[PDB]
């Protein structure tokens, strides 16, 4: 997958978090007392073709452009809504060949209840992707790998960089090299991979900060710092809540804060 852009794009689409609110363009509520027909002339043809509880109609129009861009199917959205609401709502969806992509719903004083249900729908209907991963980017990485003759030669590969962190879930996605997934939040690294991985990640982050402007600090100093921060089995912050919570002498501790 690393050397093929198409499979990489497929993986990127599969990882990124997408909700109903992302593709929904507008939502509307209509009064329609006939379940087998409708008042709106525009949607009359589609509903009658489909046909060949409360009167409160809840419909919403999906942006066709972004719906196509997210590579989604109207059937998939309807199935997700049905799964999250069982049989409490009757759902009809327009075909992909319609001028405007629309989906209709019906409940099987309720206007405020319908508004609350619509807000909940726009809120927590998850279509696909790992929760917490807002954005994903394709990035090209240059890696030096020994050749068949033993010579080191540069090579370009595709990798993904995200916004937001969910290490445990992303590591489990098929097609992802689970033995090299890395995060810049070492608290999650501690919660997932242990304390030695936290030590390595902490050193990497510190070195990244220091060496950005071309400066160089010897390895042993940063090694000592990150060995102090992770010597108790957990991350010990360099603050009063980290230093003063040790077993050191009271006179030594009181001299700081």
């Amino acid at each position: 997958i690393a050397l093929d852009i198409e499979k990489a794009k497929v993986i990127q689409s599969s990882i990124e978090y997408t909700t109903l609110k992302n593709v929904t363009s507008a939502t509307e509520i209509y009064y329609d007392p006939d379940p087998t027909s409708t008042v709106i002339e525009e949607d009359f043809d589609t509903v009658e073709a489909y046909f060949s509880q409360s009167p409160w109609l809840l419909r919403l129009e999906l942006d066709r452009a972004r719906m196509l861009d997210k590579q989604l199917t109207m059937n998939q959205v309807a199935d997700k809504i049905s799964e999250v609401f069982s049989d409490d709502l009757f759902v009809m969806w327009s075909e992909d060949n319609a001028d405007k992509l629309i989906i209709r719903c019906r409940v099987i004083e309720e206007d405020q209840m319908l508004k609350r249900i619509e807000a909940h729908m726009l809120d927590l209907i998850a279509l696909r992707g790992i929760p917490g991963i807002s954005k994903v980017y394709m990035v090209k990485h240059k890696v030096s790998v020994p050749d068949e003759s033993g010579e080191y030669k540069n090579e370009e590969l595709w990798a993904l960089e995200t916004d937001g962190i969910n290490l445990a879930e992303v590591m489990a996605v098929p097609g992802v090299d689970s033995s090299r997934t890395y995060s810049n939040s070492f608290v999650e690294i501690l919660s997932v991979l242990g304390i030695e991985a936290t030590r390595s990640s902490l050193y990497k982050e510190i070195l990244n900060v220091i060496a950005f402007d071309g400066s160089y600090v010897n390895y042993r100093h940063m090694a000592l710092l990150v060995d102090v921060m992770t010597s108790r089995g957990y991350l010990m912050a360099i603050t009063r809540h980290g230093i003063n919570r040790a077993d050191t002498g009271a006179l030594m501790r009181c001299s700081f804060e």
């Binding site: 390895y219 042993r220 090694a223 000592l224 060995d227 102090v228 010597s231």
Partner: peptide, 9 residues
């Protein structure tokens, strides 16, 4: 308490 078993490894 031991921080490192050998300075700078």
């Amino acid at each position: 308490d031991i921080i490192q078993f050998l300075y700078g490894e």
